[PDB]
Write a protein that binds this ligand. Structure first.
Ligand code: GDP
Ligand code: FAR
Ligand code: MG
Lengths: 147, 171
């Protein structure tokens, strides 16, 4: 299982990613940096106005040389090093040697309950755990600036 | 999450003790008087089974049997506390009507019989409240706004029930 996890990791890459206003499909942020790479503290600068969207559609384009039965993500959002909230997403079956566009909807909390950009910026780390079912493949971290 | 945010609406007939229960919980005092007409939001941290919750408590200005159910008592609510007074048959009749209108609009619900300290004025037994709650598949407690632990117990219970079954603040 440790060996299989390494094989999946070696063959897995994020090609590109979008964040869109869910209503309009207008792209607010995009990148081609592979934010899935473990062991580096990646950074991303997202427009602060994203916090004003009712809902955000995220597109993750990924390739995987290895087959996966139940590909899924756990994302823990840390604020000043402490757990703020957790996001869960499931993709499911992944065909070996395929490239896939995964669309996920992220709904905002009520407007009065949103964290202010001035507080969040540079203080957020998202830790993403990549799973095939119960097998932990990899973990990455991205520090967020809301600009 | 270190702190889980929840919004709770407190509903019931005027004078049942909605404000007094909420203030006993939030401030740890029995308030001398609090404007019967005012609808306000209270904020309070509470730990339940080791998890901190950040509570947004909507202390409503009370409905009677003829009141339209406000849409704002329904939006983004994690749990409802429905309060009557054990000293008022009218309040008990009204809470049944409020519950029906609530279900029409929409659900963690609990039923609370308040003023249990007023033994000489009691007209509703524990058992009658309990039977109503069972018919709703809801939790039931009696309380007194003069007794801190019974107010704390009410708010811990609705959290317990809510957790037995979406929106992000950083995105
Ligand atoms: N003895 C006693 N009096 C209460 C209790 N709860 C509320 N009261 C009193 O009943 C009256 C109405 O209480 P209030 O909290 O304003 O009711 P609300 O209209 O539902 O918000 C006030 O005079 C309170 O002091 C209780 O548990 N015991
Ligand atoms: C509105 C979305 C926000 C603020 C964060 C979106 C997430 C990232 C950027 C990090 C995603 C990282 C991976 C999928 C590895
Ligand atoms: Mg009141």
């Amino acid at each position: 299982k440790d060996e299989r996890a390494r094989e999946i990791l070696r063959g897995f890459k994020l090609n590109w990613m979008n964040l869109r206003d869910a209503e309009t499909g207008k792209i607010l942020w995009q990148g081609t940096e592979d934010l899935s790479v473990p062991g580096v503290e990646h950074e991303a600068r997202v427009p602060k106005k994203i916090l004003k969207c009712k809902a955000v559609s995220r597109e993750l384009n990924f390739s995987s040389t290895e087959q996966m039965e139940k590909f899924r993500l756990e994302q823990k959002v840390y604020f000043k090093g402490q757990c703020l909230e957790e996001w869960f997403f499931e993709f499911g079956f992944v065909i070996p040697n395929s490239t896939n566009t995964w669309q996920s909807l992220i709904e905002a909390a009520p407007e009065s309950q949103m964290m202010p950009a001035s507080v969040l910026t540079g203080n957020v780390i998202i830790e993403t755990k990549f799973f095939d079912d119960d097998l932990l493949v990899s973990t990455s971290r991205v520090r967020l600036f809301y600009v | 999450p270190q702190s889980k945010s929840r919004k709770i609406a407190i509903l019931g007939y005027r004078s049942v003790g909605k404000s007094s229960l909420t203030i006993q919980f939030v401030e740890g005092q029995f308030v001398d008087s609090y404007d019967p007409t005012i609808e306000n939001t209270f904020t309070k941290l509470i730990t339940v089974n080791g998890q901190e919750y950040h509570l947004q408590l909507v202390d409503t200005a009370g409905q009677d049997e003829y009141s339209i159910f406000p849409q704002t008592y329904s939006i983004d609510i994690n749990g409802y506390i429905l309060v009557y007074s054990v000293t008022s048959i009218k309040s008990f009749e009204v809470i049944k009507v409020i519950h029906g209108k609530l279900l029409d609009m929409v659900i963690p619900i609990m039923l609370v019989g308040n003023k249990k300290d007023l033994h000489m004025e009691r007209v509703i037994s524990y058992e009658e409240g309990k039977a109503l709650a069972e018919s709703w598949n809801a939790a039931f407690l009696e309380s007194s706004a003069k007794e801190n632990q019974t107010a704390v117990d009410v708010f811990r219970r609705i959290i317990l029930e809510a957790e037995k079954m979406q929106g992000k603040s950083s995105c």
